[PDB]
Design a protein around this nucleic acid. Structure first.
Ligand SMILES: [Mg+2]
Ligand SMILES: [Mg+2]
Ligand SMILES: [Mg+2]
Ligand SMILES: [Mg+2]
Ligand SMILES: [Mg+2]
Ligand SMILES: [Mg+2]
Ligand SMILES: [Mg+2]
Ligand SMILES: [Mg+2]
Ligand SMILES: [Mg+2]
Ligand SMILES: [Mg+2]
Ligand SMILES: [Mg+2]
Ligand SMILES: [Mg+2]
Ligand SMILES: [Mg+2]
Ligand SMILES: [Mg+2]
Ligand SMILES: [Mg+2]
Ligand SMILES: [Mg+2]
Ligand SMILES: [Mg+2]
Ligand SMILES: [Mg+2]
Ligand SMILES: [Mg+2]
Ligand SMILES: [Mg+2]
Ligand SMILES: [Mg+2]
Ligand SMILES: [Mg+2]
Ligand SMILES: [Mg+2]
Ligand SMILES: [Mg+2]
Ligand SMILES: [Mg+2]
Ligand SMILES: [Mg+2]
Ligand SMILES: [Mg+2]
Ligand SMILES: [Mg+2]
Ligand SMILES: [Mg+2]
Ligand SMILES: [Mg+2]
Ligand SMILES: [Mg+2]
Ligand SMILES: [Mg+2]
Ligand SMILES: [Mg+2]
Ligand SMILES: [Mg+2]
Ligand SMILES: [Mg+2]
Lengths: 100, 126, 82, 151, 99, 208
RNA sequence: CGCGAAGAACCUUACCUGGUCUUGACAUCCACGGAAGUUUUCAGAGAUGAGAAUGUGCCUUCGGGAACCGUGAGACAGGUGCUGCAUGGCUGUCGUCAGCUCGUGUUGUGAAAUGUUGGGUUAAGUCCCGCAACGAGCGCAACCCUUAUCCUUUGUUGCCAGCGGUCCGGCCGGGAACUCAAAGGAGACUGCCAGUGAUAAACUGGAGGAAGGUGGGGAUGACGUCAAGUCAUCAUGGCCCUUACGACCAGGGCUACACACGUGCUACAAUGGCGCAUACAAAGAGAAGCGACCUCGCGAGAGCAAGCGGACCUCAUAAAGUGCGUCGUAGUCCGGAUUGGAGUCUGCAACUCGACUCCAUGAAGUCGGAAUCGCUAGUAAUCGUGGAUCAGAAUGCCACGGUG
């Protein structure tokens, strides 16, 4: 994509994987059962003050080479066209063109 | 002493065992009426035992796995028509004349790209 | 609707602001760019102004509104008729 | 097709009786591949007819199909600057193929409560030369004599 | 007993890699249980080709992970040691498993 | 665009792969960037070299980069520098103990990447493409390669309407699967655009 | 025209209104003070300013450099901004149609022709025979993957024909037979008997075979054409911008609606609704994941915690069908649209805008005008299940089987 979007993604992943201690120790208190009903109201006001980008929902898988956001594949890591250009040259192992 | 067959219809694999006897029909430890619904399936499961005159003389043990309700009927038909060729072998010319030795090489045909079924196109405008 | 057992949603920057603004009383219209808060019962009788996409629109909030969220009195895109 | 002259394919016999005539007739009653309910409806109505006529179960069918086989029919040519119909004779297979199709096209137009009854009525009527089957047969069979000047 | 998995992508490279294990166990001792052919997962993928607008043009690729498995019944000390002496060519994965 | 890339229709029939490692789904993602980051730096660095084909290979968390090249003395140089200096950066990028080789490409008039890079350097230095293609076909034909097609495309000779050209010789059946077809392309970035080059070299039919 | 988009609430996002920044959000070079640092208050919608607890892995002729960091001058950065009629690469089409051409030779003043035409034949410029033609190349066929029967080899997590225990569950001693899982092979060639043939090329029947004439499907798309399609995947030649066409943030927007067209799903019912019992599949997927057993809930689902990098464990129950009821041609116990009340889950957050379950509501529609669409055998027609993209979200897309 543009040259800023990949910088935005490598700025987002750092925060979202840095604050991974607190957002499994706020959702525990929120989505528990026997906990305090007046601490379950402060552990829901902390969750809107941990910074907004620090969230493992707020990032689309960019391509590992171009930066194209659509048409991903998870297993290779490359987009719809840059999997074709490698698999029709030979750089991805065992990836023969299928027919049956 | 017993004789053996193996047949394959659409997506089934029958397995038939023949002994001389009175006529018992056992399929997955079930009697022949307990398994099958329709009288054409009870026809086609019996058909080559009627074709030669060998209903009464022999009992048989049958196991079948995987397929549909016609698959586990044509499979047993091909199984018995194999397994009777290891009984007297001059049954073969008349089973071949009757058209029971040929395994049907039909099978489900795959779905290609841009075809909403195996051969159905989508619709068309101008 | 939300799951109930998380409780209702409200931003901190509007919750603390509204508990200050009740205890300072002024009906100078309180503006906000947070149109996703469940209106609370101690917000009865206030003049807030929610963003709509262009500007604030003023909302005087009564007893009747307190179930809903602050968006449903800011209609978003203008429409007049063809 | 243009080139390959091809063969009329085989068929299973009927389950119950033993006639390869009924193999087409259980097939033409069918929608969406469910041949079992087609095997059931027909073997109910071919007992209700076999009771209402007082004839045998196999023999109440052929002598009601006799009244709906045609003998000649028309096709269309336009050789010169003019559409002609042409009365051609009909083939011994397409004879029965038309006969068993008109009856089932008629028997989805009655007002009864069941398909068995809708086919038992439609076979008794065409066993007594009345009904929406033999009236269609009269139309087809009369468009030959209305066009025997064409050949 | 001691079982070893073998995973690969190519069945002219899994068979030498398993014959060089059967002819290691049967050269330090005995009682191997052969290779047993497990199922073969074929991970298909289907992508478009054209860079902008052609939904009716596709390439279809597959990846066919070949499995094998080999048991070892009565292990000596040199029987277990001359196996962990052995490495294999790239493409083949192993995972030793006592029982 | 109507023809399949004639390497990748033969990727199991004759031609073998250019990376032979193995990992499961959790590492197959990362290996296709730790492969491309070590092909990109080498294709940058040894650009002056005659490099044709880099084959990577991972036995037991350790890389093994084979370079195919035809000027091995301008990648090694004095007694002990260039490949052993490349070891410490390939090990940094791949994060494993690096291991580099060198493979001599005998007869560099036939290795299909090398004729392509020869022509795409010639069209950087502005020679007549009509002479360059015929020189390439002549040198690859008398060396013993049973057939060759060369094709250039786009902005040829500085023109303002683009077109292609192509020269055959011998026999080049792309529909016959079991041939030894060698195919590669290249892209000269001149002062007028990008002038693409495709080659095709038939070294012989190959049984199996 | 269910097309890029294999999945827009924020993100994506390119657009809008606001608030803000200008060697920059993103790099190398420095001018160069100064180790990075989990934490933490005020103000702000947030952007980010104001504020609180710190240093030694190198190690230095200590007028300076190493992964990390602030400020100002710069050189370049940056553009999803125009040009697909300047281009590369990649694709759709005529078309899976059997055609497109060259080398010598001869004839023609010459453009060009002969070959490639003609009589037979094939799915085919396929093959034979004749000919100022002789030979060859890309194509039209074959090599390749899958499906169809047999023979070896290796037998667990797969299997149980004959053995003995058996909780009548291949479960448990066992067995290598068999289905099956996969490696290597055997097999089909117009090869064989007859007949029409121009003695040849073939073709028509039938014998053996599991398969008959290309056994059934796929993969492969010649020379080229419409200046076909994208500069918005990426790279690019020139051009335009540089307190903006660059860059960060919150909230809106792509989802509006008087209407028209294209593609699909569900129906208009008895071959069918509803309620109870009852059998038979295939192909896939899974560690921030698939999550069985057990309990609470009318139900979506929360509760507890085994099992599994998987022929072991899960998702997982197949539905059409078969049997016994009920129903009786009605806007119907048909059909589920639209609206109200109450809830569950992922998620910072379901108001514009999420799927799902329960209680209500029960519209339009009785087979559809001119005109048009798909299909030649496991095919069309109906029935269910899985996957990719994905935190949640497809009636489309891609796959496999069941009836036929
Ligand atoms: Mg997302
Ligand atoms: Mg139209
Ligand atoms: Mg269209
Ligand atoms: Mg046809
Ligand atoms: Mg489509
Ligand atoms: Mg194509
Ligand atoms: Mg958004
Ligand atoms: Mg164009
Ligand atoms: Mg182009
Ligand atoms: Mg355009
Ligand atoms: Mg123009
Ligand atoms: Mg000539
Ligand atoms: Mg002359
Ligand atoms: Mg021609
Ligand atoms: Mg000519
Ligand atoms: Mg001819
Ligand atoms: Mg030819
Ligand atoms: Mg071919
Ligand atoms: Mg014959
Ligand atoms: Mg024959
Ligand atoms: Mg155009
Ligand atoms: Mg554009
Ligand atoms: Mg770029
Ligand atoms: Mg935004
Ligand atoms: Mg849209
Ligand atoms: Mg309309
Ligand atoms: Mg009912
Ligand atoms: Mg999943
Ligand atoms: Mg419960
Ligand atoms: Mg209802
Ligand atoms: Mg309700
Ligand atoms: Mg009405
Ligand atoms: Mg009616
Ligand atoms: Mg999903
Ligand atoms: Mg189907």
């Amino acid at each position: 994509a543009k040259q800023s979007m990949k910088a935005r993604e490598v700025k987002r992943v750092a925060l979202a994987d840095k604050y991974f201690a607190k957002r499994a120790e706020l959702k525990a208190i929120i989505s528990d059962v026997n906990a305090s009903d007046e601490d379950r109201w402060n552990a829901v006001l902390k969750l809107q003050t941990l910074p907004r980008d620090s969230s493992p929902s707020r990032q689309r898988n960019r391509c590992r080479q171009t930066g194209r956001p659509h048409g991903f594949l998870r297993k290779f890591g490359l987009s719809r066209i840059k999997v074709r250009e490698a698999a029709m040259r030979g750089e991805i192992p065992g990836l023969k063109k299928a027919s049956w | 002493n017993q004789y053996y067959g193996t047949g394959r219809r659409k997506s089934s694999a029958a397995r038939v065992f023949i002994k001389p006897g009175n006529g018992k029909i056992v399929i997955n430890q079930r009697s022949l009426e307990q398994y099958f619904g329709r009288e054409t399936a009870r026809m086609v499961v019996r058909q080559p035992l009627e074709l030669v005159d060998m209903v009464e003389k022999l009992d048989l043990y049958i196991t079948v796995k995987g397929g549909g309700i016609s698959g586990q009927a044509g499979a047993i038909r091909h199984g018995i028509t194999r397994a009777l060729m290891e009984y007297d072998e001059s049954l073969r010319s008349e089973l071949r004349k009757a058209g029971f030795v040929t395994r049907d090489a039909r099978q489900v045909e795959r779905k290609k790209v841009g075809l909403r079924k195996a051969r159905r196109r989508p619709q068309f405008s101008k | 609707p939300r799951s109930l057992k998380k409780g209702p949603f409200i931003d901190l920057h509007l919750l603390k602001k509204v508990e200050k603004a009740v205890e300072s009383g002024d009906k100078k219209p309180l503006r906000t760019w947070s149109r996703r808060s469940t209106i609370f019962p101690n917000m009865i009788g206030l003049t807030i102004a929610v963003h709509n996409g262009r500007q604030h629109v003023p909302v005087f909030v009564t007893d009747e509104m307190v179930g809903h969220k602050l968006g449903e009195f800011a209609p978003t895109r203008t429409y007049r008729g063809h | 097709p243009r080139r390959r002259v091809i063969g009329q394919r085989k068929i299973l016999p009927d389950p119950k009786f033993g006639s390869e005539l009924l193999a087409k007739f259980v097939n033409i009653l069918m929608v969406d591949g469910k041949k079992s309910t087609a095997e059931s409806i027909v073997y109910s109505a071919l007992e209700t007819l076999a009771q209402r006529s007082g004839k045998s179960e196999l023999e109440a069918f052929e002598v009601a199909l006799e009244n709906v086989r045609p003998t000649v029919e028309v096709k269309s040519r336009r050789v010169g600057g003019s559409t002609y119909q042409v009365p051609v004779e009909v083939r011994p297979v397409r004879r029965n193929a038309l006969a068993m199709r008109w009856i089932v096209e008629a028997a989805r137009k009655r007002g009864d409560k069941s398909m068995a009854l809708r086919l038992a009525n439609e076979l008794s009527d065409a066993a007594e030369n009345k009904g929406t089957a033999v009236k269609k047969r009269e139309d087809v069979h009369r468009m030959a004599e209305a066009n025997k000047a064409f050949a | 007993r001691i079982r070893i998995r073998l995973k690969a992508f190519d069945h002219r490279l899994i068979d030498q890699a398993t014959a060089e294990i059967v002819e290691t166990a049967k050269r330090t001792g005995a009682q191997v249980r052969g290779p047993i052919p497990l199922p073969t997962r074929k991970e298909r993928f289907t992508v478009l080709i054209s860079p902008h607008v052609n939904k009716d043009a596709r390439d279809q690729y597959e990846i066919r992970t070949h499995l094998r498995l080999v048991d070892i019944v009565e292990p000596t000390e040199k029987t277990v040691d001359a196996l962990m002496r052995l490495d294999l060519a790239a493409g083949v994965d192993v995972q030793i498993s006592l029982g | 665009g109507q023809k399949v890339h004639p390497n990748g229709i033969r990727l199991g029939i004759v031609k073998p792969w250019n990376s032979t490692w193995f990992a499961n789904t959790k590492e197959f993602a990362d290996n296709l960037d730790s492969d491309f980051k070590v092909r990109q730096y080498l294709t940058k660095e040894l650009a002056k070299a005659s490099v044709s084909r880099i084959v990577i290979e991972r036995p037991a968390k350790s890389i093994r980069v084979t370079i195919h090249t035809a000027r091995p003395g301008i990648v090694i140089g004095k007694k002990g520098e260039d490949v052993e200096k490349l070891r410490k950066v390939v090990a940094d990028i791949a994060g494993v103990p690096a291991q580099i080789n060198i493979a001599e490409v005998r007869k560099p008039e036939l290795d299909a990447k090398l004729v392509a890079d020869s022509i795409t350097s010639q069209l950087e230095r502005r020679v007549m493409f009509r002479r360059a293609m015929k020189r390439a076909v002549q040198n690859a034909m008398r060396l013993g390669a049973k057939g060759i097609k060369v094709e250039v495309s786009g902005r040829l000779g500085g023109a303002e309407i683009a077109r292609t050209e192509w020269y055959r010789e011998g026999r080049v059946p792309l529909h016959t699967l079991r041939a030894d077809i060698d195919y590669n392309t290249s892209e000269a970035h001149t002062t007028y655009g990008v002038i693409g080059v495709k080659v095709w070299i038939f070294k012989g039919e190959i049984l199996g």
